[PDB]
Coordinates of C-alpha atoms and ligand atoms in Angstrom, one line a residue:
Chain A
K350 CA -0.4 -0.2 -0.3
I351 CA 2.6 1.7 0.7
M352 CA 4.9 1.7 -2.3
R353 CA 1.6 2.6 -5.1
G354 CA 1.5 6.0 -3.6
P355 CA 2.5 8.2 -5.6
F356 CA 5.4 9.6 -4.3
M357 CA 6.8 6.2 -3.9
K358 CA 6.6 6.2 -7.7
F359 CA 8.4 9.1 -7.7
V360 CA 10.7 7.6 -5.6
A361 CA 11.3 4.5 -7.9
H362 CA 11.0 6.3 -10.7
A363 CA 14.2 8.3 -10.1
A364 CA 15.6 5.1 -9.1
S365 CA 15.0 3.5 -11.5
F366 CA 16.9 6.1 -14.0
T367 CA 20.1 6.1 -11.1
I368 CA 20.2 2.7 -12.2
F369 CA 20.2 3.2 -15.7
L370 CA 22.4 6.0 -15.7
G371 CA 25.1 3.8 -13.5
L372 CA 25.0 1.2 -15.5
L373 CA 26.1 3.8 -18.8
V374 CA 28.8 4.7 -16.4
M375 CA 29.9 1.1 -15.7
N376 CA 29.1 0.0 -19.0
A377 CA 33.1 0.9 -19.8
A378 CA 34.8 0.0 -16.5
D379 CA 37.4 -2.1 -17.9
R380 CA 38.5 0.9 -20.0
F381 CA 38.9 3.3 -17.0
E382 CA 42.9 4.0 -17.3
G383 CA 43.9 1.9 -19.8
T384 CA 42.4 -0.6 -23.1
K385 CA 44.7 -2.9 -23.1
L386 CA 44.0 -4.1 -26.8
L387 CA 45.3 -1.5 -29.2
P388 CA 44.3 -0.8 -32.3
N389 CA 47.4 -2.7 -33.8
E390 CA 47.3 -5.9 -31.5
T391 CA 44.2 -8.8 -31.8
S392 CA 42.8 -11.4 -28.9
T393 CA 40.9 -14.4 -28.6
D394 CA 41.8 -16.4 -25.7
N395 CA 39.8 -19.6 -27.1
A396 CA 42.6 -20.2 -29.6
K397 CA 39.2 -21.5 -32.1
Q398 CA 37.4 -18.7 -32.2
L399 CA 37.9 -15.2 -34.9
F400 CA 38.6 -11.6 -33.6
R401 CA 35.3 -10.5 -34.0
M402 CA 33.6 -12.8 -31.7
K403 CA 35.0 -11.1 -28.5
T404 CA 33.9 -8.1 -29.7
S405 CA 31.2 -8.6 -30.8
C406 CA 29.5 -10.1 -28.4
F407 CA 27.0 -8.9 -25.7
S408 CA 27.5 -8.5 -22.3
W409 CA 24.7 -8.6 -19.0
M410 CA 25.4 -5.0 -18.8
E411 CA 24.6 -4.4 -22.1
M412 CA 21.5 -6.8 -22.1
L413 CA 20.6 -5.3 -18.7
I414 CA 20.5 -2.1 -20.6
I415 CA 18.6 -2.9 -23.7
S416 CA 16.1 -4.1 -21.2
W417 CA 15.6 -1.2 -19.9
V418 CA 15.7 1.1 -23.5
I419 CA 13.6 -2.2 -24.6
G420 CA 10.9 -0.6 -21.9
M421 CA 11.2 3.2 -22.1
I422 CA 10.2 2.5 -25.8
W423 CA 7.4 1.0 -24.4
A424 CA 6.3 2.7 -22.0
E425 CA 6.8 6.1 -24.6
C426 CA 4.7 4.4 -27.3
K427 CA 1.7 3.3 -25.1
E428 CA 1.5 7.1 -24.2
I429 CA 1.4 8.8 -27.5
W430 CA -1.0 7.2 -28.5
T431 CA -3.3 7.9 -25.4
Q432 CA -2.7 11.5 -26.5
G433 CA -2.4 11.0 -30.6
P434 CA 0.3 13.2 -33.0
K435 CA -0.9 15.8 -32.0
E436 CA -0.4 17.1 -27.8
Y437 CA 2.2 14.6 -28.5
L438 CA 4.5 16.0 -31.2
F439 CA 3.1 19.6 -30.3
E440 CA 6.0 19.4 -27.0
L441 CA 9.5 19.7 -27.6
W442 CA 11.5 17.7 -25.8
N443 CA 9.0 14.3 -26.9
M444 CA 11.3 15.5 -29.8
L445 CA 14.6 14.6 -27.6
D446 CA 13.1 11.5 -26.0
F447 CA 12.0 9.5 -29.0
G448 CA 15.8 11.0 -30.8
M449 CA 17.2 9.4 -27.5
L450 CA 15.5 6.2 -27.7
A451 CA 15.7 5.4 -31.9
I452 CA 19.6 6.3 -31.6
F453 CA 20.4 3.8 -28.7
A454 CA 17.3 1.2 -31.3
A455 CA 19.9 1.7 -34.2
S456 CA 22.8 1.5 -32.1
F457 CA 22.0 -2.3 -30.7
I458 CA 20.0 -2.9 -34.3
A459 CA 24.4 -2.4 -36.1
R460 CA 25.6 -4.5 -33.5
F461 CA 23.4 -7.2 -34.0
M462 CA 24.0 -7.0 -37.3
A463 CA 27.7 -7.4 -36.8
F464 CA 27.1 -9.8 -34.8
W465 CA 25.0 -11.8 -37.1
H466 CA 27.9 -11.9 -39.3
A467 CA 30.3 -12.2 -37.7
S468 CA 29.0 -15.2 -36.4
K469 CA 27.5 -16.2 -40.0
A470 CA 31.1 -16.1 -41.0
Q471 CA 32.7 -18.1 -37.8
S472 CA 29.8 -21.0 -38.6
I473 CA 30.7 -21.1 -42.2
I474 CA 34.1 -21.9 -41.2
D475 CA 34.9 -23.4 -37.4
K485 CA 46.6 -21.6 -38.5
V486 CA 47.1 -21.5 -42.6
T487 CA 45.5 -18.6 -45.2
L488 CA 42.0 -18.5 -44.8
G489 CA 39.6 -18.0 -48.0
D490 CA 38.2 -15.6 -49.1
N491 CA 34.9 -15.0 -47.9
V492 CA 36.0 -15.3 -43.8
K493 CA 39.6 -12.8 -44.8
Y494 CA 37.7 -9.5 -43.6
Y495 CA 37.2 -11.2 -39.6
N496 CA 39.8 -11.9 -37.6
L497 CA 41.6 -8.9 -38.3
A498 CA 42.7 -5.5 -36.3
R499 CA 41.0 -2.5 -35.9
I500 CA 43.4 0.1 -39.2
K501 CA 42.1 -2.8 -41.7
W502 CA 38.4 -2.5 -40.8
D503 CA 35.8 -0.4 -44.0
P504 CA 35.0 3.3 -42.6
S505 CA 31.4 1.7 -43.2
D506 CA 31.4 -1.3 -40.8
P507 CA 28.0 -2.5 -39.5
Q508 CA 30.3 -1.6 -35.5
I509 CA 32.0 1.4 -35.6
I510 CA 28.2 2.9 -36.4
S511 CA 27.1 1.8 -33.4
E512 CA 29.9 2.8 -31.3
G513 CA 30.0 6.0 -33.0
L514 CA 25.6 6.3 -32.3
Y515 CA 26.4 4.8 -28.9
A516 CA 27.6 7.6 -27.6
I517 CA 25.2 10.3 -29.1
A518 CA 22.4 8.5 -27.1
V519 CA 25.1 7.9 -23.4
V520 CA 24.9 12.6 -23.7
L521 CA 21.5 12.1 -24.3
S522 CA 20.0 10.2 -21.9
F523 CA 20.8 12.5 -19.5
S524 CA 18.3 14.9 -20.6
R525 CA 16.2 12.7 -18.9
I526 CA 17.4 14.5 -15.6
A527 CA 14.2 17.5 -16.8
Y528 CA 11.6 15.1 -15.9
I529 CA 12.5 14.6 -12.1
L530 CA 14.6 18.5 -10.9
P531 CA 10.7 20.3 -11.0
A532 CA 9.7 18.6 -8.0
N533 CA 12.3 20.1 -5.8
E534 CA 11.7 23.3 -4.4
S535 CA 15.6 25.1 -5.0
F536 CA 15.8 24.0 -9.0
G537 CA 12.4 24.7 -10.4
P538 CA 12.3 27.8 -10.8
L539 CA 16.0 27.1 -11.6
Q540 CA 14.6 25.4 -14.8
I541 CA 11.3 27.6 -14.9
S542 CA 14.3 30.1 -15.5
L543 CA 15.7 28.2 -18.1
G544 CA 12.9 27.6 -20.8
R545 CA 11.6 31.6 -19.7
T546 CA 15.3 32.3 -22.2
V547 CA 15.6 29.5 -24.4
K548 CA 12.6 31.2 -26.2
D549 CA 15.4 34.1 -27.5
Chain B
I550 CA 26.6 30.0 -8.2
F551 CA 25.9 26.5 -6.2
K552 CA 22.5 25.4 -7.5
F553 CA 24.2 26.6 -11.7
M554 CA 27.2 24.6 -10.7
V555 CA 25.1 21.0 -10.1
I556 CA 24.0 22.2 -13.7
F557 CA 27.8 22.8 -14.5
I558 CA 28.9 19.4 -13.3
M559 CA 25.3 17.7 -15.2
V560 CA 27.1 19.1 -18.6
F561 CA 29.9 17.8 -17.5
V562 CA 30.1 14.7 -16.4
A563 CA 27.7 13.8 -19.4
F564 CA 29.6 14.7 -22.1
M565 CA 32.7 13.2 -20.2
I566 CA 31.1 9.3 -20.3
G567 CA 29.7 10.2 -24.0
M568 CA 33.2 11.3 -25.8
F569 CA 35.3 8.5 -23.0
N570 CA 33.4 5.7 -24.6
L571 CA 33.3 7.2 -27.8
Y572 CA 37.0 7.6 -28.2
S573 CA 38.4 4.3 -25.9
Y574 CA 39.1 2.2 -28.7
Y575 CA 41.4 4.4 -30.0
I576 CA 43.9 4.7 -27.4
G577 CA 47.2 4.9 -29.8
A578 CA 45.4 5.7 -32.8
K579 CA 45.0 9.2 -32.1
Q580 CA 47.5 12.8 -32.3
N581 CA 47.5 13.2 -28.9
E582 CA 46.2 10.9 -25.9
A583 CA 42.6 13.0 -25.2
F584 CA 39.7 11.4 -24.6
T585 CA 41.2 7.8 -24.4
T586 CA 41.0 7.5 -20.7
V587 CA 38.6 8.9 -18.1
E588 CA 41.6 11.4 -15.7
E589 CA 42.4 12.2 -20.2
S590 CA 38.9 13.3 -21.1
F591 CA 38.5 14.9 -17.6
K592 CA 41.6 17.0 -18.2
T593 CA 39.6 17.8 -21.7
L594 CA 37.0 18.9 -21.1
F595 CA 37.1 20.8 -18.0
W596 CA 40.1 22.9 -19.7
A597 CA 38.3 23.4 -23.6
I598 CA 36.1 26.0 -20.8
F599 CA 38.9 28.2 -20.8
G600 CA 39.8 27.6 -24.4
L601 CA 43.1 25.7 -23.2
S602 CA 42.6 22.4 -25.2
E603 CA 43.4 22.3 -28.3
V604 CA 40.8 21.7 -31.6
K605 CA 42.9 18.5 -32.6
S606 CA 42.2 16.2 -29.9
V607 CA 39.7 15.2 -31.4
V608 CA 40.6 13.2 -34.7
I609 CA 42.5 10.1 -35.4
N610 CA 44.5 9.1 -37.6
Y611 CA 42.6 6.3 -39.2
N612 CA 39.8 6.9 -42.0
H613 CA 37.4 6.7 -39.7
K614 CA 35.7 9.9 -40.6
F615 CA 32.0 8.9 -38.9
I616 CA 34.0 8.3 -35.3
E617 CA 35.9 11.8 -36.1
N618 CA 32.8 14.2 -37.0
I619 CA 31.0 12.8 -34.5
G620 CA 33.4 14.1 -32.0
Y621 CA 33.9 17.0 -33.5
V622 CA 29.4 17.1 -33.5
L623 CA 30.2 16.1 -29.2
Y624 CA 32.7 18.8 -28.6
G625 CA 31.1 21.7 -30.3
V626 CA 27.9 21.1 -28.8
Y627 CA 29.6 21.0 -25.2
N628 CA 31.0 24.5 -26.4
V629 CA 27.8 26.0 -27.1
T630 CA 25.9 24.5 -23.9
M631 CA 28.8 25.4 -21.9
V632 CA 28.4 28.9 -22.6
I633 CA 24.6 29.3 -22.6
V634 CA 24.7 28.0 -18.8
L635 CA 27.0 30.5 -18.4
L636 CA 24.6 32.9 -19.4
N637 CA 21.5 31.4 -18.0
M638 CA 24.3 32.1 -14.2
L639 CA 24.4 35.7 -15.3
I640 CA 21.0 36.9 -16.3
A641 CA 20.2 34.9 -13.0
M642 CA 23.1 36.2 -10.9
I643 CA 21.6 39.8 -12.1
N644 CA 17.7 39.6 -10.9
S645 CA 19.1 37.6 -7.1
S646 CA 20.5 41.1 -7.0
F647 CA 17.8 43.6 -8.7
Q648 CA 15.7 42.2 -5.6
Chain C
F599 CA 36.1 29.9 -29.0
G600 CA 39.3 31.1 -30.0
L601 CA 40.6 27.7 -31.5
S602 CA 41.7 28.9 -34.6
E603 CA 44.8 31.0 -35.6
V604 CA 45.6 33.7 -37.6
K605 CA 47.9 32.4 -40.1
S606 CA 44.8 30.4 -40.8
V607 CA 44.5 33.4 -43.5
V608 CA 48.0 34.3 -45.0
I609 CA 49.8 32.2 -48.2
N610 CA 52.8 31.4 -49.6
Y611 CA 53.5 34.1 -52.6
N612 CA 53.2 37.3 -52.9
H613 CA 49.5 38.4 -53.8
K614 CA 49.4 41.1 -50.6
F615 CA 45.8 42.1 -52.1
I616 CA 43.9 38.6 -51.5
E617 CA 45.5 38.4 -48.0
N618 CA 44.7 41.6 -46.7
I619 CA 40.8 41.1 -47.6
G620 CA 41.2 38.2 -45.9
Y621 CA 42.7 40.0 -42.7
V622 CA 40.0 42.0 -42.7
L623 CA 37.3 39.7 -43.6
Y624 CA 38.4 37.5 -40.9
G625 CA 38.2 40.2 -38.3
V626 CA 34.9 41.6 -39.5
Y627 CA 33.6 38.4 -38.8
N628 CA 34.9 38.2 -35.4
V629 CA 33.4 41.2 -34.5
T630 CA 30.3 41.1 -35.7
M631 CA 29.6 37.3 -34.4
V632 CA 30.9 38.9 -30.6
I633 CA 27.8 41.6 -31.1
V634 CA 25.7 39.5 -32.2
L635 CA 26.7 38.5 -28.7
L636 CA 26.4 41.0 -27.2
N637 CA 22.8 41.4 -28.5
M638 CA 21.7 37.8 -27.6
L639 CA 22.5 38.8 -23.8
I640 CA 20.5 41.7 -23.9
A641 CA 17.5 40.4 -25.7
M642 CA 17.9 37.2 -22.9
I643 CA 17.7 40.0 -19.8
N644 CA 14.4 41.3 -21.9
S645 CA 13.5 38.6 -21.6
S646 CA 13.5 37.7 -18.2
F647 CA 12.5 41.2 -16.4
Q648 CA 9.4 40.8 -17.5
Ligands
SBM701 C1 25.0 25.2 -34.4 C2 24.7 24.8 -32.6 C3 24.1 24.4 -31.7 C4 23.6 24.8 -30.7 C5 23.5 23.8 -29.0 C6 23.4 23.8 -28.6 C7 22.3 23.3 -27.4 C8 21.5 24.6 -26.4 C9 21.2 23.7 -25.1 C10 19.7 24.4 -24.0 C11 19.2 24.0 -23.2 C12 17.4 24.8 -22.5 O1 17.9 26.1 -22.4 O2 16.4 23.6 -21.9 C13 16.0 24.6 -20.9 C14 15.5 23.7 -19.4 C15 13.9 23.3 -20.6 O3 13.2 23.9 -20.2 P1 11.8 23.8 -20.1 O4 11.0 24.3 -21.4 O5 11.1 24.4 -18.8 O6 11.6 22.3 -20.3 C16 11.1 21.7 -19.8 C17 10.7 19.5 -20.0 N1 9.8 18.9 -18.8 C18 9.6 19.8 -17.3 C19 8.0 19.6 -19.8 C20 10.2 17.5 -19.1 O7 16.3 22.8 -19.5 C21 16.8 21.7 -18.6 O8 15.4 21.8 -18.1 C22 18.1 21.7 -18.3 C23 18.2 20.2 -17.6 C24 19.5 20.1 -16.5 C25 20.1 19.0 -16.9 C26 20.7 18.7 -18.2 C27 22.0 18.2 -19.0 C28 21.7 17.7 -20.5 C29 23.4 17.4 -20.7 C30 22.5 17.2 -22.2
Y01_702 C1 26.8 14.2 -11.2 C2 24.9 13.9 -11.8 C3 25.2 12.9 -13.2 C4 24.8 12.8 -11.5 C5 24.1 11.4 -11.3 C6 22.4 11.2 -11.0 C7 21.9 10.6 -10.1 C8 22.6 10.3 -9.1 C9 21.0 12.5 -9.7 C10 21.2 13.2 -11.1 C11 19.7 13.9 -10.4 C12 19.2 13.4 -8.9 C13 17.4 13.8 -8.3 C14 16.9 15.2 -8.7 C15 15.7 15.6 -8.0 C16 14.9 14.6 -6.8 C17 13.6 15.4 -6.0 C18 13.9 14.7 -4.5 O1 12.5 14.9 -4.0 C19 12.1 16.3 -4.0 O2 12.8 17.2 -3.5 C20 10.0 15.8 -3.4 C21 9.7 16.1 -2.2 C22 8.6 16.4 -1.6 O3 7.4 16.5 -2.6 O4 8.1 17.0 -0.7 C23 14.5 13.3 -4.0 C24 15.8 13.0 -4.6 C25 15.8 13.1 -6.5 C26 15.1 12.5 -7.1 C27 17.3 13.9 -6.6 C28 17.7 11.8 -6.8 C29 19.1 11.5 -7.4 C30 19.6 12.5 -8.7 C31 18.5 11.2 -9.7
Y01_703 C1 17.0 14.3 -30.4 C2 18.1 14.6 -31.9 C3 18.4 16.5 -31.8 C4 19.1 14.5 -32.5 C5 19.8 15.3 -33.0 C6 20.5 14.6 -34.6 C7 22.8 14.5 -34.6 C8 23.2 14.9 -33.0 C9 23.1 13.5 -34.8 C10 22.0 12.1 -35.5 C11 21.9 11.6 -36.9 C12 23.6 11.9 -36.5 C13 25.0 12.2 -37.8 C14 24.7 11.1 -38.9 C15 25.1 10.6 -40.6 C16 26.2 11.4 -40.3 C17 27.6 11.3 -41.3 C18 28.8 10.6 -41.1 O1 30.0 10.4 -42.3 C19 30.7 10.3 -42.1 O2 30.9 8.9 -42.0 C20 32.5 10.5 -43.4 C21 32.8 9.2 -44.2 C22 33.4 8.3 -43.7 O3 34.6 7.8 -44.0 O4 32.3 6.9 -43.9 C23 29.5 11.0 -39.8 C24 28.3 11.4 -39.0 C25 27.1 11.8 -39.0 C26 27.9 13.3 -39.5 C27 26.4 11.7 -38.0 C28 26.6 13.5 -36.8 C29 25.2 13.2 -35.8 C30 23.9 13.5 -36.1 C31 24.0 14.5 -36.9
Y01_704 C1 29.9 49.2 -48.2 C2 31.1 49.6 -47.1 C3 31.0 49.5 -45.9 C4 32.2 48.7 -48.4 C5 33.8 49.6 -47.2 C6 34.4 48.7 -47.8 C7 36.2 47.4 -47.3 C8 35.0 46.6 -47.3 C9 36.8 47.5 -48.8 C10 36.4 48.5 -50.2 C11 37.4 48.1 -50.7 C12 38.6 47.5 -49.8 C13 40.4 47.7 -50.0 C14 41.0 48.5 -51.8 C15 42.1 48.3 -51.3 C16 43.4 47.9 -50.3 C17 44.4 47.8 -51.1 C18 45.3 46.5 -51.5 O1 46.6 46.3 -50.4 C19 48.5 45.6 -51.4 O2 47.3 45.2 -52.5 C20 48.8 44.4 -50.4 C21 50.6 45.1 -52.3 C22 50.6 44.1 -53.2 O3 51.2 43.1 -53.1 O4 49.8 44.9 -54.0 C23 44.9 45.1 -50.3 C24 43.2 45.0 -50.3 C25 42.8 46.5 -49.7 C26 43.3 46.4 -47.8 C27 41.1 46.2 -49.9 C28 40.7 46.3 -47.8 C29 39.0 46.0 -48.1 C30 38.1 47.4 -48.6 C31 38.2 48.2 -47.7
R0D705 O1 33.5 21.5 -36.4 C1 32.2 20.4 -37.2 C2 30.9 20.3 -36.0 C3 31.1 21.4 -34.8 O2 30.6 21.4 -33.9 C4 28.8 21.1 -34.6 C5 27.9 21.5 -33.8 C6 26.7 21.9 -34.3 C7 26.4 21.8 -35.7 C8 27.5 21.5 -36.4 C9 29.2 21.3 -35.8 O3 30.3 21.3 -36.8 N1 32.1 19.7 -37.8 C10 31.8 18.9 -38.1 C11 30.8 19.1 -39.7 C12 32.0 19.2 -40.8 C13 32.2 17.3 -41.0 N2 32.3 17.0 -43.0 C14 32.2 18.6 -43.2 C15 31.7 18.2 -44.6 C16 30.9 20.0 -44.7 C17 30.8 20.8 -44.3 CL1 30.1 22.1 -44.5 C18 31.0 20.7 -43.0 C19 31.9 19.4 -42.2 C20 33.1 19.6 -40.9 C21 33.5 19.7 -39.0
R0D706 O1 44.9 42.5 -38.9 C1 44.2 43.2 -40.5 C2 42.9 43.4 -40.6 C3 42.2 43.1 -39.1 O2 41.0 43.2 -39.9 C4 40.1 44.6 -40.2 C5 39.1 44.9 -39.5 C6 38.1 46.3 -40.1 C7 39.0 47.0 -40.5 C8 40.5 46.6 -40.3 C9 41.4 45.6 -39.8 O3 42.6 45.2 -40.2 N1 45.3 43.1 -41.7 C10 45.0 45.0 -42.1 C11 45.6 46.1 -42.4 C12 47.1 44.9 -42.2 C13 47.5 44.7 -44.1 N2 49.1 45.7 -44.2 C14 49.0 47.4 -43.5 C15 49.7 48.3 -43.3 C16 50.0 49.3 -42.2 C17 48.8 48.8 -41.6 CL1 48.4 50.1 -40.0 C18 47.6 47.8 -41.7 C19 47.9 47.0 -42.8 C20 47.7 44.2 -41.1 C21 46.4 43.2 -41.4

């Protein structure tokens, strides 16, 4: 009965957003003081799989981030049809929310098809000179194409990680000290 | 001022995590060591406020111009956003003294 | 933001006509941008004193 009150629902939503931001911080936790994987070298750690299987496998933190953003797209698509494309599209912060969710979705879509190409190439050929169908795998960062579907994912993921911090403005007008500050920012943003 | 420092810290931490996630995989393949660790991303985006961070801190050596153009756009948006937050802090400080 | 150097406008030949055109255009650009910023500040002040 306490956990279905409005204030506890607000606290639970703020806590889930805090968990999402902490996951976005701690996802790149092996590279805080150094990557230890140079763009010239290659590491597989199994001596049977190729290099593009280690760089394309989803971790558990990435699976949790995918779960959070799928829940966010679901909770936004449930609300866009309740108000229609007249009250939703009129507000310009819904543009920012839909853009952040779309860029996250495109990043995960590109990472999935990169992993699918890598898994297909590792499945059709399960140390000699490899043939001319899986030779654009087990390669370093220099010899990737400029339109590789993993660097598209890594490019969109940074924009989505920057844009996901704009949801503080949804929980910020509940405070007595940072509410009028947001009101003053929105007052001056028009000029 | 101590209420706009929180907004400064929010924009700073957001862009720090974003550009560190963008440039961490190019640690030995850049012109300088910026945005390759959390310390270098910190000392790049902090001294970009006073104009002590050069614009070639964001380019790479390979022909991946996708990630380089993402870095240019993110760094320009960071600079414009910091100038906007400073110009709003000035108006808030004016209004807090005309009362 | 002051991250473009002033030697971005000079050439190697002895065509100082085009180089002086470039100096004048770049200085006028910088002064005009400062003026538009100072007018944006006053508009933002007037939009908050109402
Ligand atoms: C070629 C040049 C490129 C230009 C790019 C520059 C970007 C300009 C940013 C302006 C932000 C602003 O003033 O927003 C005003 C208020 C919203 O007012 P309102 O109109 O009241 O919006 C109400 C929103 N609502 C309560 C309805 C959810 O914003 C905030 O609340 C600030 C949030 C604090 C921290 C966020 C971190 C961001 C990291 C990227
Ligand atoms: C360095 C930066 C990036 C901080 C990282 C993100 C979070 C740890 C911060 C940012 C925004 C914060 C929130 C801003 C506003 C509030 C409202 C506050 O409650 C009230 O003020 C209203 C109570 C009432 O109704 O009387 C509870 C804390 C909370 C959720 C904060 C919880 C912690 C948050 C999520
Ligand atoms: C919620 C709203 C406000 C989002 C705003 C959009 C931008 C913040 C994002 C989304 C689309 C992105 C762009 C998508 C395509 C391009 C072209 C691309 O160009 C190249 O790849 C160079 C050639 C090569 O070597 O492949 C580089 C990234 C870039 C500029 C991206 C820059 C950042 C953009 C503009
Ligand atoms: C509508 C009004 C406000 C127009 C204002 C006038 C200026 C914007 C223009 C018109 C005349 C131009 C000038 C004409 C003559 C000179 C001298 C010339 O000097 C040399 O050629 C160096 C020696 C050589 O090697 O030939 C270089 C360009 C310059 C400064 C020009 C600079 C830009 C000027 C001042
Ligand atoms: O410097 C920047 C950023 C700085 O931050 C920005 C912030 C908001 C909007 C634009 C910004 O541009 N770029 C990106 C675009 C760039 C890359 N290739 C081309 C080709 C033609 C043109 Cl006309 C431009 C370019 C040049 C370098
Ligand atoms: O730097 C500039 C520009 C910068 O932008 C300007 C904007 C508006 C008005 C003047 C500006 O001067 N120049 C141009 C003039 C210059 C070229 N030969 C001489 C000889 C004697 C003197 Cl006394 C000066 C010069 C020096 C370099």
